[PDB]
Design an enzyme around this catalytic site. Structure first.
Site, short mmCIF file in Angstrom:
data_model
loop_
_atom_site.label_atom_id
_atom_site.label_comp_id
_atom_site.label_asym_id
_atom_site.label_seq_id
_atom_site.Cartn_x
_atom_site.Cartn_y
_atom_site.Cartn_z
N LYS A 136 -8.08 -7.02 4.33
CA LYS A 136 -8.43 -8.42 4.73
C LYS A 136 -9.75 -8.39 5.60
O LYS A 136 -10.34 -9.44 5.67
CB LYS A 136 -7.23 -9.08 5.39
CG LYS A 136 -6.09 -8.37 5.91
CD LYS A 136 -4.81 -9.28 6.03
CE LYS A 136 -3.63 -8.56 6.72
NZ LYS A 136 -3.67 -8.84 8.05
N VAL A 139 4.55 2.44 -4.68
CA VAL A 139 3.91 3.23 -5.34
C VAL A 139 4.48 4.79 -5.72
O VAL A 139 4.00 5.50 -6.19
CB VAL A 139 2.47 3.73 -4.51
CG1 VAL A 139 1.60 2.65 -4.49
CG2 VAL A 139 2.69 4.15 -3.24
N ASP A 192 -17.15 7.01 2.08
CA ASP A 192 -18.09 7.60 3.21
C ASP A 192 -18.77 6.77 3.67
O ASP A 192 -20.02 6.71 3.32
CB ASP A 192 -18.73 9.01 2.94
CG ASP A 192 -19.08 9.60 4.36
OD1 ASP A 192 -19.52 8.99 5.00
OD2 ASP A 192 -19.10 11.00 4.30
N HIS A 193 -18.67 5.71 4.44
CA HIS A 193 -19.29 4.60 5.05
C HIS A 193 -20.79 4.87 5.62
O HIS A 193 -21.69 4.00 5.46
CB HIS A 193 -18.66 3.53 5.79
CG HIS A 193 -18.59 4.24 7.45
ND1 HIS A 193 -17.60 4.99 7.67
CD2 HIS A 193 -19.04 3.85 8.41
CE1 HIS A 193 -17.41 4.98 9.19
NE2 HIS A 193 -18.72 4.11 9.57
N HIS A 205 -19.35 12.97 7.63
CA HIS A 205 -20.41 12.23 7.72
C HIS A 205 -21.73 13.17 8.03
O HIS A 205 -22.72 13.29 7.13
CB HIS A 205 -20.64 11.49 8.98
CG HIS A 205 -19.12 10.64 9.04
ND1 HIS A 205 -18.80 10.09 7.71
CD2 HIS A 205 -18.28 10.29 9.85
CE1 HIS A 205 -17.71 9.37 7.87
NE2 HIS A 205 -17.31 9.57 9.25
N1 LIG Z 1 -9.20 -0.09 8.54
C1 LIG Z 1 -10.13 0.57 8.92
O1 LIG Z 1 -10.90 0.31 9.64
C2 LIG Z 1 -9.81 1.94 8.25
C3 LIG Z 1 -11.12 2.49 8.09
C4 LIG Z 1 -11.32 3.63 7.76
C5 LIG Z 1 -10.33 4.14 6.68
N2 LIG Z 1 -9.22 3.42 6.34
C6 LIG Z 1 -8.51 4.10 5.51
O2 LIG Z 1 -7.74 3.07 4.57
C7 LIG Z 1 -6.54 3.18 4.05
C8 LIG Z 1 -5.56 2.03 4.75
O3 LIG Z 1 -6.14 1.43 6.08
P1 LIG Z 1 -5.49 0.31 6.46
O4 LIG Z 1 -6.30 0.16 7.80
O5 LIG Z 1 -5.87 -0.83 5.76
O6 LIG Z 1 -4.02 0.41 6.83
P2 LIG Z 1 -2.60 -0.25 6.87
O7 LIG Z 1 -2.53 -1.75 7.54
O8 LIG Z 1 -1.44 0.19 7.19
O9 LIG Z 1 -1.96 -0.78 5.37
C9 LIG Z 1 -1.34 0.00 4.47
C10 LIG Z 1 -1.14 -0.92 3.08
O10 LIG Z 1 -0.38 -0.13 2.20
C11 LIG Z 1 0.74 -0.78 1.82
N3 LIG Z 1 1.66 0.26 1.58
C12 LIG Z 1 2.71 1.14 2.37
N4 LIG Z 1 3.35 1.69 1.76
C13 LIG Z 1 3.20 1.46 0.43
C14 LIG Z 1 4.05 2.04 -0.60
N5 LIG Z 1 5.15 2.67 -0.14
N6 LIG Z 1 3.68 1.34 -1.70
C15 LIG Z 1 2.72 0.50 -1.99
N7 LIG Z 1 2.02 0.03 -1.05
C16 LIG Z 1 2.22 0.58 0.32
C17 LIG Z 1 0.90 -1.88 2.98
O11 LIG Z 1 1.73 -2.76 2.36
P3 LIG Z 1 3.42 -2.93 2.45
O12 LIG Z 1 3.71 -2.35 3.70
O13 LIG Z 1 3.77 -4.31 2.24
O14 LIG Z 1 3.83 -1.99 1.33
C18 LIG Z 1 -0.37 -2.17 3.57
O15 LIG Z 1 -0.81 -3.06 2.63
C19 LIG Z 1 -6.29 4.43 4.93
O16 LIG Z 1 -6.45 5.64 3.90
C20 LIG Z 1 -7.11 4.54 6.06
O17 LIG Z 1 -7.27 6.03 6.33
C21 LIG Z 1 -9.29 2.54 7.04
#
Ligand SMILES: NC(=O)c1ccc[n+]([C@@H]2O[C@H](COP(=O)([O-])OP(=O)(O)OC[C@H]3O[C@@H](n4cnc5c(N)ncnc54)[C@H](OP(=O)(O)O)[C@@H]3O)[C@@H](O)[C@H]2O)c1
Ligand SMILES: NC(=O)c1ccc[n+]([C@@H]2O[C@H](COP(=O)([O-])OP(=O)(O)OC[C@H]3O[C@@H](n4cnc5c(N)ncnc54)[C@H](OP(=O)(O)O)[C@@H]3O)[C@@H](O)[C@H]2O)c1
Lengths: 485, 485
Positions: free
Chosen positions: A19, A86, A177-178, A240
């Site tokens: 989002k 998943v 890798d942004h 990076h």
């Molecule tokens: N946001 C950042 O700034 C950021 C930056 C760099 C990297 N990342 C990477 O992006 C990835 C996630 O980031 P996030 O910040 O968006 O995390 P997050 O808020 O924890 O979101 C996790 C998502 O996975 C879903 N989920 C959890 N367990 C699941 C399962 N068992 N089966 C299916 N779906 C499942 C959750 O939905 P439900 O709980 O409803 O299942 C939720 O939509 C990670 O690899 C992180 O390293 C994020």
């Protein structure tokens, strides 16, 4: 502009990243006319939402990027959702169904992109099920976008790669890798190959050393839980820094196609020297930030949730060596750390001073080509000129260029760029398996020495550019860090 | 700072140039501590003045450069005067006497500099009498500073040189050309030889063409009497332009000594192609300014004291060719004219575009190194970089540097520099006989075609950068003027 026909599935569709970054990036591609009629976005997670509720989630996500209400709604109409776990194989049949319905509604022939915005432990699991449960398109392409990190050692990364290769070829894998998706990083190849005076000088006969700096002013903050086990080494260097270095050290490609660019980068990566315990102590420096010059700049061990016995590195500096004819004897210095003097991501290329004798008091110094990537795009060229004195003498002057506000306005966010490149099938701004595995081998060699405490841990005052050992490293070859803070 | 022991005699000591430029320049050298106790200035002209009256003339001349009254007076005390007619041999005995008295009073052993700030017709006369009447020092050096012009054709210049060689060796002759005494012109050699990336590219394999522009916005003004017989050809090309070109085309010297610099410049000058009638029509363009876009910008023929049948050139543009391995196939375009779009003295070095294929819509253009000498010192480097577009493409960006206000403040006036260089015996910023004779041979070849009206005379609108024929000239080789106005 030409239309991109694609179906993208977002695992972790209700996540923070989805989002805050993903949906607005895709919306941008729609605003620019790349996405028109034949495209669909399928969101998924465990949370039980229906299509309307998901659409509202997306609506609120793109709210701040809306001008034309009608435009926003036409876009939102391309979204659908399906609850799914998943780890549950059977449950994949339900997601398969949603994907096929979306393809029918919008008439999309294959061309599927799966984005994994979930926890790293699910990466291999998801890919294997996409294959076994039949979610992969039999027409067009199938591409996987893997979020960071891609492993935590060579072994785990090798394992992940193996699991991923069950359903995809490496050319279908797009590791996020942004930093590689940053506009200025992409200017390196343009400056080098687009200008013969630089192209011809990009080798050992003109370059003395190359320096890559990724400094930050902030501390570990609230991220102690993750950071303490990773350090500057895994958080900034392995990923990076190594990939930026790839752009700098690559051979001249046969053409500017992603395949040729990778072959030229790999020639460099394959010539990188892997260090043993002795070499690690000699060419690398690990440090941890101490107190600052006030009270809010507390030492790393006094940070919240940091084990008082932590020997974690909040700073890394080291010399890289490439066994290629063009880089023989040319050290590549890299450094990244927290609580340093300034937030900055830059590349400094030091050219050997000339040997022409002016008979002046001050002889010709070294020319420097600097490329500032963060915080603001800039390019500077420090050259030797005549000083304003009665007697003839030399001095250095700086020719500079800065990105204009119009430039900033038109520059795509790194995520928009990455998603767009994936839809295009362009792998040039993405690290391939070879580059990533070598980056891991190189880093593992250092990690091994650190966890076994076979190397000293240095300390540095918060606000400085690092410990004196960092300067000692370059002084050994008669070099010095260009950026002083 | 070290003391300069010298005795300078100013012929035409009561002249406009002496009081507006010469005396204040010498005063500056005193303020900087170069001139201390052992120095004397002897002024001379026909006007019957005594030492007090001349001192007052000097006092009023340096008035605007005085801070410390005591300083001004200590300087003025070093001046003496003697009435003298330069055409009267016997009268030289009187000047000889004044010179020797001054040397005694201030204890100066030889080291004499004679400055000729008189009408050109006296140049040869004065030099011959200095020798025959015994005014030359038998100790130390004897140097002659000749004001412009140095001849009006090869023949007259050859005659003058012959007369001058009666009493001096060429290494003792210092021909005034204020453009060579300009700080930025002296930065050329520093940029080239002080930076290996430019030094190595200063040849036919990297350079496409070199452009030298000396544009002015003013018209002939009140100077019709002189200008009509000289034109842009003799007033700007033969002298200023040719000597700037000398710095640009020279070979790499063995050392930065005046002797070696001249040998390197002469290697170039000796390889310059002298044109015949056919080549003049093909490689050069002569023009005269027509009406402007208002009423005060009247045509050259309607200027005061301009003969309605004048075919004088107020603009010249041409291609120079050097028969040296480093310049094979590299045209040197030059242009100078009145009533053009802007006042500017600059050098633009166009580098050949690279042949690397990006597969982009816009491929790599030519990089350009620009050195602006007038009105304000600047250096710009137009390079190829990545455009801010979704698809990879190239664009040119400009890295720039401008002289700072502090720089401007410390920069010596051209006359101060020239007098100072002469006291030092440094001939590097002065044209020698070989360079000047070749400049004349080259120009005479063109003059001959013009006075015989064997070449068309073009016209151009005041305010433009010249006639279309100027552009036609470069278009023949696939080149174009960089500076558009
Ligand atoms: N946001 C950042 O700034 C950021 C930056 C760099 C990297 N990342 C990477 O992006 C990835 C996630 O980031 P996030 O910040 O968006 O995390 P997050 O808020 O924890 O979101 C996790 C998502 O996975 C879903 N989920 C959890 N367990 C699941 C399962 N068992 N089966 C299916 N779906 C499942 C959750 O939905 P439900 O709980 O409803 O299942 C939720 O939509 C990670 O690899 C992180 O390293 C994020
Ligand atoms: N001023 C400028 O901006 C300028 C710029 C570039 C070049 N120049 C060059 O500098 C030289 C003179 O410039 P100027 O502007 O200073 O001219 P100027 O005012 O005419 O001065 C001429 C000087 O020569 C003296 N003189 C005349 N006939 C003489 C003779 N028969 N014997 C001895 N002395 C004699 C005059 O003094 P008496 O009449 O009392 O004898 C006077 O001091 C010329 O070569 C000119 O081309 C001048």
């Amino acid at each position: 502009v030409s239309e991109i026909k694609t179906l993208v599935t977002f695992f972790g569709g209700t996540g923070d990243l989805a989002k805050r970054k993903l949906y607005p990036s895709v919306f941008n591609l729609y605003k620019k006319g790349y996405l028109q009629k034949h495209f669909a976005i399928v969101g998924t997670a465990r949370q039980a939402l229906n299509d309307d509720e998901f659409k509202q989630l997306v609506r609120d996500s793109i709210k701040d990027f809306t001008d034309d209400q009608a435009q926003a709604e036409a876009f939102i109409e391309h979204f659908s959702y399906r609850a799914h776990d998943v780890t549950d194989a059977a449950s994949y049949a339900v997601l398969k169904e949603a994907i096929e319905e979306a393809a029918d509604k919008f008439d999309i022939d294959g061309n599927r992109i799966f984005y994994m915005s979930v926890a790293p432990r699910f990466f291999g699991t998801i890919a294997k099920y996409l294959k076994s449960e039949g979610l992969l398109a039999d027409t067009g392409y199938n591409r996987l976008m893997i979020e960071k990190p891609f492993g935590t050692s060579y072994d785990t990364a090798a394992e992940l790669q193996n699991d991923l290769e069950n359903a995809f070829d490496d050319n279908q894998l797009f590791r996020i890798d942004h930093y590689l998706g940053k506009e200025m990083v992409q200017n390196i190849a343009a400056l080098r190959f687009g200008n013969p005076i630089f192209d011809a000088a990009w080798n050992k006969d003109y370059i003395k050393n190359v320096q890559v700096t990724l400094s930050e002013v902030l501390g570990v903050e609230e991220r102690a839980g993750y950071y303490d086990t990773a350090g500057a080494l895994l958080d900034m260097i392995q990923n990076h820094t190594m990939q930026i270095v790839g752009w700098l050290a690559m051979e001249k490609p046969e053409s500017f196609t992603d395949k040729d660019i990778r072959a030229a980068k790999n020639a460099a990566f394959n010539a990188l020297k892997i260090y043993d315990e002795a070499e690690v102590n000699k060419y690398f420096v690990r440090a941890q930030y101490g107190a600052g010059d006030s009270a809010d700049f507390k030492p790393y061990l006094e940070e919240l949730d940091v084990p008082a016995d932590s020997k974690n590195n909040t700073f890394i500096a080291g010399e890289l060596q490439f066994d290629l004819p063009r880089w023989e004897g040319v050290p590549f210095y890299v450094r990244s750390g927290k609580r340093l003097a300034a937030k900055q991501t830059r590349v400094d290329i030091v050219f050997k001073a000339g040997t022409f004798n002016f008979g002046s008091e001050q002889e010709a110094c070294e020319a420097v080509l600097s490329i500032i990537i963060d915080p603001k795009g800039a390019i500077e060229l420090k050259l030797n000129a005549k000083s304003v004195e009665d007697a003839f003498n030399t001095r250095t002057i700086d020719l500079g260029w800065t990105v204009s506000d119009e430039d900033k306005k038109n520059t795509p966010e790194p995520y928009e760029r990455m998603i767009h490149d994936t839809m295009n099938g362009d792998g040039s701004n993405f690290a391939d398996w070879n580059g990533v595995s070598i980056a891991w081998k190189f880093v593992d060699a250092i990690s091994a020495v650190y966890t076994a405490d076979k190397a000293p841990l240095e300390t540095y005052k918060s606000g400085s550019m690092g410990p004196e050992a960092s300067d000692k490293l370059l002084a050994a070859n008669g070099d010095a860090w260009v950026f002083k803070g």
